[model samples]
Target chain A: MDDLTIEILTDDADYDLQRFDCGEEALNLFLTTHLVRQHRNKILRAYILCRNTPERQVLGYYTLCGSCFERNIPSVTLGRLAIDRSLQGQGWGATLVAHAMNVVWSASLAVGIHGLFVEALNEKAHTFYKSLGFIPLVGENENALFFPTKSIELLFT
Target chain B: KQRIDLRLTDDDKSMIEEAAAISNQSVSQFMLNSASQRAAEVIEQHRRVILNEESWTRVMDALSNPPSPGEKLKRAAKRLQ
Candidate 1:
């Protein structure tokens, strides 16, 4: 309900941005150690949505990566969007997704990203994504969904 | 997490069959390969496990001096029978 600050985190600041109690230790280790090392240049972006101070505890967080999809699908891939369990049902998840779309648009000006793919954790996530205009591709896993940039753009307008 | 069957359109089914034929593979094989590739990508893309410094140290210590199977193994053997 309160105003939250969402900032893109640097590689060095990743560990601190990740709160261990949020059940995201695996993500912190993977992002800080593996993903950052592997994809150093391609904008391995992280955003921490905090209520008050940076250390006041993170309300939710999301990670994004620059990737390409099938030409028929989209050019950019928005990967690994997650939210803290305690902070679900609030507007934080949608806000995080919106931030990811903005990052994708700014990253490349050429053939802008067309869609964002998410491997939803469950039916609930799939439903959430559907509410945001992400449609499930036929024959694709029920747990995975995609939101086209066009749809996301419409949302903001 | 829930198990539910989805209805497929005739066009969807035909598209799958055509793709399978083009690949010179059985429909099941084609579908399996497609599904497996996606699964591999998802697993390779993310980190599913994490260990803290203390836990890492303990893991290293245990690996260095491995323990042999104990009564639990015997119980497992009985269960197998």
Candidate 2:
């Protein structure tokens, strides 16, 4: 198996960024301009894989944001994470997530966060999140789950 | 657009409601949004037929102009009707 390395992207190296104009053009544009672009300061993080050359094609990517819920809810929001279809089922998703959480934790060290929240796509996604210590909010929608920081620590520690 | 009253199990109903509350949306709105997004994602991911403009034009032309009186056409029309 080939080795894969993930690294945080810097703004000066914008050429390495690859955007997916997916689903509808309007939706893709909205994601790029509004969601991803606007949130660059808080949670608009991207990752690129160095495939042993300077070609710099994006293998897969995910997004993270600093989101808060009801303090009573016991979770923080981690939104809009995606991996390339060609790269699905590789460890990239997990690696991207671990990197994302580390970024979030570092950002929120002084403020503090309770848990990470994700709006999973479906049962398969729910299961994937569960594998990462995210618990489906009981009596909540099947499409989303929450991983308390305590649980994340338990799993990764 | 449309309202659907699902006879959900108690557990399922609570889960659905909680999910809705988490998003600050009504239950119906939450379900509609989630389901519509899921459907779009699945279709984009699984449907493999990529049609170029020329091929799509051919398909549209075939739909616009049907062959007349062929046995296959007659059988298909009859079955469909």
Candidate 3:
């Protein structure tokens, strides 16, 4: 934690988004492609996680975006979460998520979100999410799922 | 930031400063923290969304392990090269 810092990404922020290898091409592509455009469009916000902000050697990054399961139903989506290959298995994924959730919780209060949702691509990944307490939504066409954010204040406490 | 002058009576200022002292914060710090904290709550009360166990994991799982890219995503990635 001493060597690491988490922050909102900026145009001048030094980070290697191009060289990011997060095991998933789409995730990599999102960082390289959509992060900035989406940020500018107010479609989402990105946060960069790095060991040293000066080096711009980004260890990971995540995005938060708004969504709707139904009309007039505002929701918060965990748009993207990725960790560099070299940094995997060091609990960086969970660390980023913990921070991300906190930020989402804070921002969500101002923004008015109904639920937090995501896609479950596989069992292995689903198990990981289980540790964080995410559950599957019934009858979801796109593997849509949710969890109890009602007590988020207690989640960290 | 705009500057605003306060015209608190002596008793008002004394009582406010006393509360600030108990918080181990200067009067400004105490007022700012307390005011901002309340402001945030009032603003937040108008919104929500919290994740609990089991369900929270599913969301993280999808992010940690995204599936193959859709055609549209692939096309976007190709243009980058």
Candidate 4:
């Protein structure tokens, strides 16, 4: 949180999210390269961040998009939340979530998101979100969780 | 920012508020959630009717697998020319 500035994903940024090693090889690779920003641009909104390094290295990034639950509840979905592997184990994950939720909040205001849902890759990922007030969706079967936008709305208002 | 505690009796209020906490919502959220959901269900119940599997399949086919346009659609298409 020191000098890091969260910014929208841009072409000129030198940051890298693909290299984050949350202990999942597939997820790490998807974030770094396969998310296909150009194609996904039509589908998902992305955000990136960086420290004020001289080289301006990217420290982390996340993507949020419009989604829904059973067609009844609209949501802003968080996917591929990552911090550079070198930056892991600190409080950056939590900080990154707060930054992303702000964007989610704004997007909700624009398009009526009823909640925020994040898909975690594993238990380690689950641990991070639970601390930030996210809870698992019903059925208790997977790593996916949600933070209702109304609750988040209260935070901002 | 929401509180559903206004209309609920003490029994249901505590019961659902406890549920809301478990569901990651507050008193206000829990209240609003139930009301909105209940409304949606009521409206849909009147608007929709049940279909047997055989009819359901046919309906799905009608929705997604329409045949080539008939004379009326072709006539409409002709107007664009």
Candidate 5:
């Protein structure tokens, strides 16, 4: 979709968040219920993948929060990544993660971060994150992963 | 702030009082500071994602020589165009 755009979620935005479904009830619940409050409080920042049109039909999204690794190296957590059910198997997840990396990479330039961290929601999710070159934080656990900024640099270069 | 009650033996109370006096802090202040410091450490330990030596090396190595973006990743980035 050439018309797809990722934009920050705002309370005043005219996106159809209530109707958005990402094939997971837990993820859908968070988007419908807790996300706005968390976004308003600056507890986390969320981005919405939507059509670049008058309706701005929401499709997929991801959230980010400040986190740190052992020894206190600062980083950002990929709190959640979900794609609409219709787009799930079409490689949109990789696009969403790549978009997230671009977002984190830009932030790292302004205020340095060691990398991006993401704890997978399940074994299936762990595989997808792994395929993108994320390094596992604990051996074979595969739940927690990190994509260092140094590695992210190669994507653009 | 809510107050917390704790049971202490005479020896324990006297030791805490002596330590607080030596440190020039009120007994309440001394206890709160010590307890909070330990609480923070415990919370941080639980919250942190600690890597073993092997995992740390893998992370460092990946940073030094990142793998090229695969076909899927390349397609994904191109979609942003």
Candidate 6:
């Protein structure tokens, strides 16, 4: 955690991933199973926050995918985000989300996109997103949420 | 920048020229920048396509009427700073 950096996953990046346990089986499964295939298929991009050491252990990761609300409103979706169980409550979650906001804000400058979108799997995750100004979609999918690009930019400036 | 040109219909040229004037950019600049922007969008779209299988009506509604930023949100951003 002291010396960490986020890197985009490549097909041949060496890091200890088989041992990553985020305390969520779904997150763990995605890291090992679907991340590489979907990434190769141009379906999504995954980033990992790794420690600077010989072991090159991954402490956390997140996935971003292009998505649209309705037919017109474009956005980047946070498909999955998780921190290792060893480093769970150290506020890396907010750091990761802020990093996502920065990514979307920069991308929105040249292209047309409303903001970031996500679906919270549980109340805890829902609360985390809401605290970052991700508005809950008060419709059929109560777990759905959005954060505007303008707001994200304003935050950075 | 390297030079590039393409044949176009009068109607298309007129529309592009009018838009270029409105944007206060040279016709070439407007066309080049718009084309580049669209190129990025298409590449991004092709490369990132998952986590959107399900649909939500309220997401559309929220886009039309997004909630104002919240206090904690500001603090979170500040924390990043």
> What are the TM-scores, per candidate, against the unseen true structure?
0.52, 0.50, 0.60, 0.57, 0.75, 0.70
TM-score of 1: 0.52
lDDT of 4 by residue, A49-130 (tens): 6777765566676777666554144566687777776778766666667767777777777887656668876777887666
Show the colliding residue pairs in model 4: A15-A58, A18-A32, A115-A149, B2-B28, B3-B28
Best by TM-score: 5
Error of 6 at A140 (Å): 2.3
Candidate 2 clashes between residue pairs 3 or more apart in a chain or in different chains: A76-A115, A139-B15, A140-B15
Report model 4's TM-score to 2 decimal places: 0.57
Q: lDDT at B43 for candidate 5?
A: 60
> What's the C-alpha lDDT at position A51 in model 4?
74
- For model 1, how does the per-residue alpha-carbon lDDT over A1-157 read when each residue is reduced to its tens digit? 4556676654444334345334556555554465544445444565666665545455555666544433122345455555666776555566676666666655544665545566676576677666655555433244555554544444333
Give the residue spans of candidate 3 off by over 4 A.
B1-81
Off by over 4 Å in 5: A53-55, A139-141, B1-48
Across residues B1-81, which tens digit of lDDT does each residue of candidate 3 receive?
Answer: 986576888998899899999989999888889888997886454233344454445445544553333333233233323
Please provide, for model 3 over A1-157, each residue's C-alpha lDDT reduced to its tens digit, 9 standing for 90 to 100: 4577778887664567677788988878888888878777666788888767456777788887766543145667676788899888766676676676677667767877554665566665666555565555543333555543443434443
Q: Write the per-residue lDDT of candidate 6 for residues B1-81, one digit (tens) a residue.
A: 587769999999999999999999999899999999998988766544233324354444455666666776666556666
What's the residue-level lDDT of B49 in candidate 1? 20
Clashes of 1: 0
Model 5, A69-104: lDDT tens digits are 652777888988888888888888998889998988
Q: Candidate 4 residues B4-44, lDDT tens each?
A: 33565799978987999899998777878888999888755
lDDT of 6 by residue, A1-157 (tens): 4688777886665778789999989989888888888788778888888888896798899888888655245788888899998877767788788877777887899899887877699999999888878877654557777777777877775
3 against 6, candidate with superior TM-score:
6
Sort by lDDT, best first: what order? 5, 6, 3, 4, 1, 2
TM-score of chain A of each: 0.70, 0.69, 0.85, 0.81, 0.91, 0.94
**Chain B TM-score by candidate, in order shown:** 0.48, 0.52, 0.49, 0.50, 0.60, 0.58
